[PDB]
Amino acid sequence: TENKRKSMEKLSVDGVISALAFDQRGALKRMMAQHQTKEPTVEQIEELKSLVSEELTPFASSILLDPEYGLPASRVRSEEAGLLLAYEKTGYDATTTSRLPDCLDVWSAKRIKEAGAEAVKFLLYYDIDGDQDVNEQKKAYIERIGSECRAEDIPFYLEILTYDEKIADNASPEFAKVKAHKVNEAMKVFSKERFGVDVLKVEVPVNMKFVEGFADGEVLFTKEEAAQAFRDQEASTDLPYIYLSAGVSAKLFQDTLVFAAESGAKFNGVLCGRATWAGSVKVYIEEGPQAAREWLRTEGFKNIDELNKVLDKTASPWTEKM
Q1: Are 123 and 88 in contact (CB under 8 A)?
Q2: Which pairs with CB-CB distance under 8 Å and at least 24 residues apart come from 208-214?
Q3: How far is CA 72 from CA 59, 66, 115, 155, 211, in A?
Q4: What's the CA gap between 318 and 322, in Å, rounded?
Q5: Domains of the chain: residue spans and CATH
Q6: Helices 42-56 and 301-314, interaxial angle, to 10°?
């Protein structure tokens, strides 16, 4: 575990993971498609990932990229930034309820390490209350990956995105009502030794947009209830865990971290994506590479710098977990 520990250190600063997430594929294409009539190209996708990597990794402990479009971007990251690579095929088949995991066809943990990565990240969709046989298949799949990573001596970062088989839209009030249970129970399953997880990458256990004080519409939760969901999450695992930002704004994500910390969560960092760099997409598409670069240096930098200042007072070192 000395090789894993020193990889873990390459992904962190002072035992805190302050990482930039840009393995988005499907979601990035949908964003780019809003601003031009032509289909987003391979060249366009590769270039924007490269710009964000070159410009913002000086201010991140590591960057998460996908092997499909992100390999050029991985090669321009700052000297001090570690690399994580995504291992799962993107998205999911919405015509079925199972969302079964599937690794990229020509990739292995060994090849990911040979690409210069210090971690393998894998995203799993998980409904704790879903079909038991579907769940058995998923658990066996994660066992395999965790074994691969042990053999190649590379940290395994498991991303869990929760869902309910019975609910199509995870932004809805009916999903917000069961999110805490979905998130916290999933973490308990995948914290077991047999899965070989080094770091859990997880959602905050509340949709803050339905919490009193944050909410503009229906209120579902008091702040106390929200705070308890965070404590329940903290008690769900002894593993290092970090928060993904998903589609929330920079400011809402920052406010959530302060709230998590005040509640008693001992999260160990974040993998923050769209909140930090989303504004660059429209600029890239409408005005080009140089204009995107100028946005990244000014506005992008401000988003990430403001994130780092919040992390310095909210996040806890993972060194106190192993």
Answers
A1: yes
A2: 208/248, 208/252, 208/255, 208/256, 208/259, 209/176, 210/173, 210/176, 214/252, 214/255
A3: 19, 10, 11, 22, 41
A4: 7
A5: 1-321 (3.20.20.70)
A6: 50
